[PDB]
Write a protein that binds this DNA or RNA. Structure first.
Length: 61
DNA sequence: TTGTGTTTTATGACGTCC
DNA sequence: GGACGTCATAAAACACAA
């Protein structure tokens, strides 16, 4: 769906920062918010979703 | 350097929506 | 039969004592 002949892609610093800020604001992301964020950062909704899931896991750990 | 231990993307499997 | 949540796990990329 995302993966191809780039197994995984390194997110820019800026992107990462934005995501972190969003996470801090709230740990779950609304569909609308997700859509906005993907639009404004050059990532797919799906990518954003994945990231949030990862981040929650990380927090738990 | 460069091993090697850890972190970041990403997936399928399985679970719960109030 | 979707959407999103967990999780164990693979592989690329990084962090950094040695």
């Amino acid at each position: 769906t995302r993966t191809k002949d780039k197994y995984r892609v390194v997110y820019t610093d800026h992107q990462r920062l934005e995501l972190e800020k969003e996470f801090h604001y709230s740990r779950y992301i609304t569909i609308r918010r997700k859509s906005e964020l993907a639009a404004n950062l050059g990532l797919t909704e799906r990518q954003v979703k994945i990231w949030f899931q990862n981040r929650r896991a990380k927090e738990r750990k």
